């Protein structure tokens, strides 16, 4: 087509008469409509260098719409973006994210959105021009599709850049991004807003502020929405963002939704569902109540059955069961429902190989909770719990007894289990199982008493608690009492009766009560 | 916590030391019962870890003429048959 008028127009926008400028940009936006004349403006950096100035320095409305509208018509074409960038448009477009009119924002927030993706360098120049602050401030617009572009721009800038993740936090971010998920219904916006909340979660600086505003309770609203691209992102967020949600309510519906997700054909959902319940039941009293009231035992026991040896599923599942079976009103039922739903045999099998150690650390801790309700004393002995709990206790001692290593004794994690914890739990579990008399013949018969006595010197105050307690539960029978009184115990227990915690000044005194008396 | 409602063949024991309620926590039952043995003098003051109850109310509730102090479970289960838990 034709150019032959751009230098004529190059100076006409710079005319000091702010009325001719309106009568000048009125055709530039119109002449930018065709693909032909569009290439002319792009090849004239003297022309675009005047449109940018007329944007950041105008009092009219049609000029601001025609200018920022022209810059949008260039964004679809490649070399029309570099001209905007080499003319210093980014500091000007970010400005108009402040002036209040809707006609320019769809033209500005889009011209930035294309500039963030299809041209490099903008992801840095926008952060320097203070773009994140003006972008979060315009999250309260009544439009929904406009927010799908605005929230997506936040995802591009805060991706893997903890400088940007901290800016959105300081400028009131999480508390506003929740009132977007909690309100609107557009899938594209909710998919992006959840996609933003996740890369804000891994940074342990936004984790409480999202919880504090009300993120969990609102993200669970859309757990039933069809599009799976939105479902797992919400689950992925909660899993990373449930670490600091242990102390608030309103989750009443959130827990009666993850339980149903345990019976889903998607393994990557159950893994991101039991891990949530494992963290959301570590300290709260009434959270454990709500799980046991939605039938959470039966549904969670079945998960381990079909999980098999996949420890990534059983590790949070056993930890979740350990929480429900301890210290709350619904205790006698939570410890009973595992039996009635045929969960006792499989739990004992997890003690045996090939189960790794962090899962076993949680399973040997589950037995001490399952053994509170005395209706589980016989089935545990029937499934071979005593001879297997002793085996794990034997190695745990015959491995931390390798104090002979380098000058100072190297203690080795890596595997994740501090081997003093398996002794702290096994001898803590046997302390409960040694109430039923038939166990006290097996525990005795397995030649274990002269081993608790050597544990009784361990400087750990949690070993003495259970070792000097499991011996008290063995001290009833004289067949085991005056036998303990030979293999030590007479002297090491003599001055456990002045250790600090009043749980060891007793027990250790309860063993001496029956022994060398009459 | 834990609440149990005893059977009235036990309540006579607690109603003798000054009990007033009809249901009790296990801490309270083990308290009123320990006051009975101390008041009625049932221990053997020689070596005091033995309790006698040949022809006494405990000798009817429990069933054993002489039980030890720390036999635990039997005592725990001996008390757990004259009550009905609520």
């Amino acid at each position: 087509l034709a150019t032959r008028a751009i230098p004529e127009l190059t100076k006409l926008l710079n005319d000091e008469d702010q009325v001719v400028v309106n009568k000048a940009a009125v055709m530039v936006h119109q002449l930018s409509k065709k693909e032909a004349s569009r290439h002319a403006i792009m090849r004239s950096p003297q022309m675009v260098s005047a449109i940018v100035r007329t944007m950041q320095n105008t009092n009219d409305v049609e000029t601001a719409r025609c200018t920022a509208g022209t810059l949008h018509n260039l964004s679809h074409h490649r070399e029309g973006l570099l001209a905007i960038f080499k003319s210093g448009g980014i500091p000007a477009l970010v400005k108009m994210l402040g002036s209040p009119v809707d006609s320019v924002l769809f033209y500005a927030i889009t011209t930035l959105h294309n500039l963030l993706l299809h041209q490099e360098g903008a992801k840095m120049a926008v952060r320097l021009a203070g773009g994140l602050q003006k972008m979060v401030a315009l999250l309260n617009k009544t439009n929904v599709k406009f927010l799908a572009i605005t929230t997506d721009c936040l995802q591009i800038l805060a991706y893997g850049n903890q400088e940007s993740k901290l800016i959105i936090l300081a400028s009131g971010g999480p508390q506003a991004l929740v009132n977007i998920m909690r309100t609107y219904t557009y899938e594209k916006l909710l998919w992006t807003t959840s996609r933003v909340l996740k890369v804000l979660s891994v940074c342990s600086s936004n984790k409480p502020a999202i919880v504090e505003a009300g993120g969990m309770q609102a993200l669970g609203l859309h757990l039933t929405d069809p599009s799976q691209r939105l479902v797992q992102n919400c689950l992925w967020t909660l899993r990373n963002l449930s670490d600091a949600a242990t102390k608030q309510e309103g989750m009443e519906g959130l827990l009666g939704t993850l339980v149903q997700l345990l019976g889903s054909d998607d393994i990557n959902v159950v893994t991101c569902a039991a891990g949530i319940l494992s963290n959301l039941t570590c300290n709260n009293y009434k959270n454990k109540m709500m799980v046991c009231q939605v039938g959470g035992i039966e549904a969670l026991v079945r998960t381990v059955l079909r999980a098999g040896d996949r420890e990534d599923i059983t590790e949070p599942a056993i930890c979740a069961l350990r929480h429900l079976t301890s210290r709350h009103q619904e205790a006698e039922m939570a410890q009973n429902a595992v039996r009635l739903h045929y969960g006792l045999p499989v739990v004992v099998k997890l003690l045996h190989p090939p189960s790794h150690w962090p899962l076993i650390k949680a399973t040997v801790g589950l037995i001490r909770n399952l053994a509170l309700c005395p209706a589980n004393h016989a089935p545990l002995r029937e499934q071979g719990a005593i001879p297997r709990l002793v085996q794990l206790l034997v190695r745990a001692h015959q491995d931390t007894q390798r104090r002979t290593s380098m000058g100072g004794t190297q203690q080795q994690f890596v595997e994740g289990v501090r081997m003093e914890e398996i002794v702290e739990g096994c001898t803590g579990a046997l302390h409960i199982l040694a109430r039923d008399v038939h166990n006290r013949i097996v525990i005795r018969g397995l030649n274990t008493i002269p081993l608790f006595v050597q544990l009784l010197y361990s400087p750990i105050e949690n070993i003495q608690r259970v070792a000097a307690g499991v011996l008290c539960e063995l001290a009833q029978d004289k067949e085991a009492a005056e036998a303990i009184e030979a293999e030590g115990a007479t002297a090491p227990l003599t001055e456990l009766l002045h250790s600090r915690n009043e749980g060891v000044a007793t027990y250790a005194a309860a063993v001496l009560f029956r022994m060398s008396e009459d | 916590e834990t609440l149990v409602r005893p059977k009235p063949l036990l309540l006579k024991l607690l109603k003798s030391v000054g009990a007033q309620k009809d249901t009790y926590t296990m801490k309270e039952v083990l308290f009123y019962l320990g006051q009975y043995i101390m008041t009625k003098r049932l221990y053997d003051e020689k070596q005091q870890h033995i309790v006698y109850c040949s022809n006494d109310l405990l000798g009817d509730l429990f069933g054993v003429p002489s039980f030890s102090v720390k036999e635990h479970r039997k005592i725990y289960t001996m008390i757990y048959r004259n009550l009905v838990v609520v």
């Binding site: - | 834990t2 296990m26 320990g34 101390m38 221990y43 003051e45 005091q48």
Partner: peptide, 17 residues
């Protein structure tokens, strides 16, 4: 004559159940 009994029960009550 009465202390070795009292100190025994307030240890059997320790364990609750």
């Amino acid at each position: 004559a009465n202390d070795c009994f009292k100190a025994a029960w307030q240890c059997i009550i320790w364990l609750h159940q």
